[PDB]
Design a protein around this ligand. Structure first.
Ligand SMILES: COc1ccc2c(c1)cc(C(=O)NS(=O)(=O)Cc1ccc(C(F)(F)F)cc1)n2CC(=O)O
Ligand SMILES: COc1ccc2c(c1)cc(C(=O)NS(=O)(=O)Cc1ccc(C(F)(F)F)cc1)n2CC(=O)O
Lengths: 272, 274
């Protein structure tokens, strides 16, 4: 078949899975390294950082999937030098309805999977599909949703996928608040209090020279000094989200409700 | 990459080895054909290989793996297969069962009714195999028709870039469908086992008279057979549902002879289509 039109150096928008599949394959054959940046909802600075990270790989072509000013998101992508936007309808992604799906391992039942027990099954299923449509050399996710990032590394490993998963350190507001589309709903008292999540985590990371309990108790003190911050969990795990070893590398994760908004954050921890 | 000797049988046990070899061959223009087996190779498997061999410029990969061989490799070499992939359980499941494929509701029907995680296990391994080898085409017999359908659903649902090839079921001279499990029939059992295929063909010809006559003919033949215990006899659409049948479908049977469970199926046309 003819390869659908692709104009190098321009923003090319495809809604058909088949079309982006054919183009990406044609590009892979001409030498380019295909980079995938999946996105959902309205575009934010976190996504732009994923884009910049992918663009700096030499000979990259950047594919951004968008799976909801939508025209201004596209103008933003063009201004970033993105050459492919993949914009399929729900129908195109699911022409036979919900059928074969991915079932995550037991990690999906933990932490975020407590309030939302089937959320990661849906994420892993759509990510697998995006991975098979585009076949990128590398796929880029923020570390903000660290549990989601870990789950797709497990997906990649367990299903023997050929793709490199790249986690990009979380972009933050100037006071530390982790980027998220939810931040826009916070009133000013909520926005001032929400700084406690990141303040607690960075405190814990520095307190960690004094060991794991000192790191945890520092985090909890900072969370305790904030009004209207209902902590759902505060957990120190290994970097794979298994139990924290006695010392070594780890990750500290927090989730909290401020009014009706659920905020999450996490950070690298090194014990002692 | 590891060594590949063309026009000889190259055996790889590490997934990374077959993946690298496979990728190198595809880049140089060969089309990669995958034939999944559980070993105990029979003529039905040889027919899969032969079908894969006749794709121009094919390189054929036969995988041998049982979800947790002197014969097998011999025959493969005698067929001109250039790659056997024989992974260890540890190399396929270094983390145990973790992320898995959850099939659609067809996996809870028929064979999957008493074995509700059976097809999940199959689809998970078949997905892993496809990702390791990344073939252009993968070949399955039609005899495990439900399996074949669920594999097509896998390939469509997850957007896999592979063509699924169903090969018509090879049969012993009396019509008995080839299967590893035939070796388990005593002579009396092997004699009676012809009823499944006799039953299905009787139905396919009865079907000019409608679906009820077709089912009824098959049942009488099954009923006349010594020591054949019928699990299920079902007529369905070709994708196995959730649609009612129109004029072309599949008739499936599963029956016990002693401890041995035998399955078979056939294309059926109803009325005018017959
Ligand atoms: C580099 O710094 C950052 C900081 C924050 C970021 C990001 C990067 C990226 C996000 C983000 O929203 N990612 S996402 O939900 O759009 C990724 C994504 C997840 C699922 C799917 C689905 F369709 F597969 F389901 C698509 C994209 N976020 C916000 C967040 O994860 O909520
Ligand atoms: C074309 O003529 C025939 C006739 C019978 C055949 C075949 C071909 C092939 C088979 C056969 O054994 N197919 S299979 O189920 O072993 C394919 C297969 C299924 C799962 C896996 C696993 F590694 F994922 F588990 C591998 C191969 N069989 C026997 C059978 O399907 O029971």
């Amino acid at each position: 078949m003819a390869i659908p039109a692709f104009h190098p150096g321009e923003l090319n928008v495809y809604s058909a899975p088949g079309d982006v599949a054919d183009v990406s394959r044609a590009l892979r054959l001409t030498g380019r390294r295909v980079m995938l940046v999946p996105t959902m909802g309205a575009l934010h600075e976190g996504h732009l950082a994923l884009v910049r990270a992918a663009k700096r790989v030499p000979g990259s072509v950047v594919v951004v999937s968008i799976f909801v000013t939508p025209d201004d998101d596209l103008a933003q992508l063009r201004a970033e030098g993105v050459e492919i936007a993949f914009t399929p309808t729900t129908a195109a992604m699911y022409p036979d309805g919900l059928r074969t799906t991915v079932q995550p391992g037991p990690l999906a039942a933990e932490l975020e999977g407590g309030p939302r027990p089937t959320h990661f099954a849906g994420v892993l299923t759509v990510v697998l599909k995006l991975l098979q449509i585009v076949r990128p050399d590398r796929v880029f996710f923020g570390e903000k949703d660290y549990q989601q990032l870990v789950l797709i590394r497990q997906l990649v490993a367990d299903f023997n996928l050929d793709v490199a998963v790249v986690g990009v350190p979380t972009v933050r507001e100037a006071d530390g608040l982790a980027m998220s589309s939810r931040n826009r709903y916070l009133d000013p008292a909520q926005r001032a209090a929400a700084v406690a999540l990141s303040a607690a985590l960075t405190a814990a990371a520095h307190a960690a020279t004094a060991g794991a309990q000192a790191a945890l108790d520092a985090a909890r003190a900072v969370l305790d000094a904030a009004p209207g911050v209902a902590v759902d969990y505060l957990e120190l795990r290994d970097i794979g989200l298994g139990p924290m070893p006695l010392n070594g590398s780890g990750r500290l994760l927090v989730a909290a409700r401020l009014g009706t908004t659920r905020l999450l954050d996490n950070i690298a921890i090194e014990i002692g």
